[PDB]
Every structure is written in structure tokens, then in C-alpha cells.
Write a protein that binds this DNA or RNA. Structure first.
Ligand code: DG3
Ligand code: CA
Ligand code: MG
Ligand code: MG
Ligand code: MG
Length: 341
DNA sequence: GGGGGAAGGATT
DNA sequence: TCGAACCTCCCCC
């Protein structure tokens, strides 16, 4: 199987560049402003000029300003990036009917039936990169290998504006040499649990007792890591369908007062319903983020589709339930809809 | 013993 | 310090 993975470079910042070319060369920082104090919020993403100095996704806007006070700070315009993303995914469908759109800026293509070897795959990669640069003026990084996981790892190694092939021999080498923390799906918490069991490379999972591994990271992740270490990772490129849509907002101040939280909850429902564009959900979950950033949630599944009015009344009942069963103050409140018809 | 669904956790 | 979207206790057969 030959997999071709496409990851758009610094997507949100790059789209703003394409819409305002004078931004080119300048550190551009796309932010999510919450509405809680002057410059409260986080950096969603930044281009390379900004990342060179430490400004990256996740840090508070206030800290980014201390590092680069003269960078260009722009508010997130997700809807614009989503439209530009949908046009690039439509361009990728031309290269394969087996395509997996993993997020707004990532897609895997199974190109086994389009190329014979990695030399032909590498050329197809240049061709896709040229086609996207030509049509939308967006640079992307291409990763190629024998499965989705190594294709992504290749793209992580080659970004930005790159193209890399990790052949069978390199896959075998990485299984021995790659820090296991760089394997997709292994975040800080799992990486630390694995540094504790001694595991630091994929090959180390083959020699540890399975129940010891399973007991620490769970059955699916143990099986996943082992399958990769055995060079037996088999996951087909599958068409992905949006399974849930929702919106969670931060309130001006933390609260437990139902009538005070209500307008935020209702706005989240309004925004969520606009986004559902023709999908009718059968399940709704009210999601609260407590003052100490924990996530509490209550939901309900109906045997029928949920009308906006049923979403309004059921959400209050679910919010009341959250207030009843949890004593902490709520900071963020929202809703999530799923189980579409 | 193990489906299957609700809620919490981890990841990106 | 923001925020959108697969895996890990209990009812029930
Ligand atoms: N709002 C928000 N978005 C994030 C954060 N981290 C990443 N993102 C955005 C950037 C695009 C998208 C995909 O994220 P990935 O972590 O795969 O990173 P990436 O591909 O390097 O992102 P980019 O294209 O911006 O570099 O999610 C974050 O902390 N907050
Ligand atoms: Ca990207
Ligand atoms: Mg990405
Ligand atoms: Mg990037
Ligand atoms: Mg990691």
C-alpha cells in the first residue's frame, strides 16, 4: 500500500497571507480572543517568521506580545479557512477516489492504484503540490510511505513546503530509532507513561509484557503501538463523515447562576444550528468547562431529530443537571450535537 | 463474558 | 490561556 499524506502549511496564517499579500515575510499570528480581559485568549497558529521566535499555537496572546510586540495579530476567521480548505480537498479528489480528510488541513490519499513505486509516488507528490500552489497559492507538505502513520511522520519531518518518502528500510530504522513520543496519537501524557515503563522507541513495545503495557496506556493504544512496531499497522484510507458539530464559548465571568449562563448556552445553540447546514441531530450534549479547566457533560439521545426548540429546552434541563451534580463554578459552556439522520 | 451507551480523558 | 472533533463504569442479555 502506498499512502500520500497532504498537510497544509501554517494553514490559518497562510490563508490570511493569500488574502492580504502584503503580510508576506512578516510574523503573522492568528488568535482566538475570548473576551475576558485585554488580550485574553490563545494563539491558534502562527507562520514560520513568528514560530522562529517561540510564538506558536497554544501560548497566551499576552505572552506572544511580549516576544513579538510588532507581529501582525489577526482574529480567527475559521469560516474563511474552511472554505479555502474545501476547495483544496476538492482538488485532491482528482488524484484518488480513496481519500480521507482528517481535519481542515490534512488528508490522506491511498495512491496504490495510481503508482507502482515510491519514485512515481514522489513525482505525483510534486504534481499535487504544484497543482495546489497553482490553483490556490497555498504551499503544503507531502509525506509518503506504506501506511498512514509513517506518511504523517514523513510530513512532520519535511514541513514546511516539503516532500519526503520513508521507504520500507527507513520504516524499519524508525521503528528502532524514532522517539516514540513523535508517533501520532502519543501526547505528553502517554509519552510520560511510556518513559516510565522504559519504552522510548517503538521496538521496545515488542519485549514488554502486554498486560503491563495495556494496564498503563490501555488496550487500543498498546495494540496500536505494537502493530506499528511489528511493521503490521493496517488501517485503510476511509471516507470520513462529520459525526458531531458544536460550539462552546467562554463567559465574561465564571458563574453557577442558571439565568446568567443561559444566553451563552443559547448563543452556542444558535451558532451550532447554523453550522449543522441541513444535518438533523438525534443527540445533544451540554458541555461545561469548570473554573479549573475540567470538562463536565450531560447529554440525551432522542428516537427522532432535534428541533431548535427541543434543543433549547433540553439544554436547560441538561445544564440544570450539570449544576446539580457538580458544585464547581462554570467558565465555558456549550453544546455538541451528534447521531445525525 | 461481553454487547452497547453515557460520561470522562487524551490527542490534534 | 482557545477551542472543535476515538478510547476508556454500569445496564442488560
Ligand atoms: N485553536 C487552536 N487551533 C490549534 C491549536 N494547535 C493547532 N491548531 C490548529 C492549526 C491547524 C489545525 C491542525 O493542527 P496540528 O496540531 O495538526 O498542527 P499543524 O498542522 O502544524 O498546524 P499548522 O498548519 O497551523 O501548523 O489545528 C491550538 O492550540 N488552538
Ligand atoms: Ca498544517
Ligand atoms: Mg496538520
Ligand atoms: Mg504546521
Ligand atoms: Mg507527541
Amino acid at each position: 500500500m502506498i499512502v500520500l499524506f497532504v498537510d497544509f502549511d501554517y494553514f490559518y496564517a497562510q490563508v490570511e497571507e493569500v488574502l492580504n499579500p502584503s503580510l508576506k515575510g512578516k510574523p503573522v499570528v492568528v488568535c482566538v480572543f475570548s473576551g475576558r480581559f485585554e488580550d485574553s485568549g490563545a494563539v491558534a497558529t502562527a507562520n514560520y517568521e513568528a514560530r522562529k521566535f517561540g510564538v506558536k499555537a497554544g501560548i497566551p496572546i499576552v505572552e506572544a506580545k511580549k516576544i513579538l510586540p510588532n507581529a501582525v495579530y489577526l482574529p480567527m476567521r475559521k469560516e474563511v479557512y474552511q472554505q479555502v480548505s474545501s476547495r483544496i480537498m476538492n482538488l485532491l479528489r482528482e488524484y484518488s477516489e480513496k481519500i480521507e480528510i482528517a481535519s481542515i488541513d490534512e488528508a490522506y490519499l491511498d495512491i496504490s492504484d495510481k503508482v507502482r513505486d515510491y519514485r512515481e509516488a514522489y513525482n505525483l507528490g510534486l504534481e499535487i503540490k504544484n497543482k495546489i500552489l497553482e490553483k490556490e497559492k497555498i504551499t503544503v507538505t507531502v509525506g509518503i510511505s506504506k501506511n498512514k502513520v509513517f506518511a504523517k511522520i514523513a510530513a512532520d519531518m519535511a514541513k514546511p513546503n516539503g516532500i519526503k518518502v520513508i521507504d520500507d528500510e527507513e520504516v524499519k530504522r524508525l521503528i528502532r530509532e524514532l522517539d516514540i513520543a513523535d508517533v501520532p496519537g502519543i501526547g505528553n501524557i502517554t509519552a510520560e507513561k511510556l518513559k516510565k515503563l522504559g519504552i522510548n522507541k517503538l521496538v521496545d513495545t515488542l519485549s514488554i509484557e502486554f498486560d503491563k503495557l495495556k494496564g498503563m496506556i490501555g488496550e487500543a493504544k498498546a495494540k496500536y503501538l505494537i502493530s506499528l512496531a511489528r511493521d503490521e499497522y493496517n488501517e485503510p484510507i476511509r471516507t470520513r463523515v462529520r459525526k458531531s458539530i458544536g460550539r462552546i464559548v467562554t463567559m465574561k465571568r465564571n458563574s453557577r447562576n442558571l439565568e446568567e449562563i443561559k444566553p451563552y448556552l443559547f448563543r452556542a445553540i444558535e451558532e451550532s444550528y447554523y453550522k449543522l447546514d441541513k444535518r438533523i441531530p438525534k443527540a445533544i450534549h451540554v458541555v461545561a468547562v469548570t473554573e479549573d479547566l475540567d470538562i463536565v457533560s450531560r447529554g440525551r439521545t432522542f428516537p427522532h431529530g432535534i428541533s431548535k426548540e427541543t434543543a433549547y429546552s433540553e439544554s436547560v434541563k441538561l445544564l440544570q443537571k450539570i449544576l446539580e451534580e457538580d458544585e464547581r463554578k462554570i467558565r465555558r459552556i456549550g453544546v455538541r450535537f451528534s447521531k445525525f439522520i
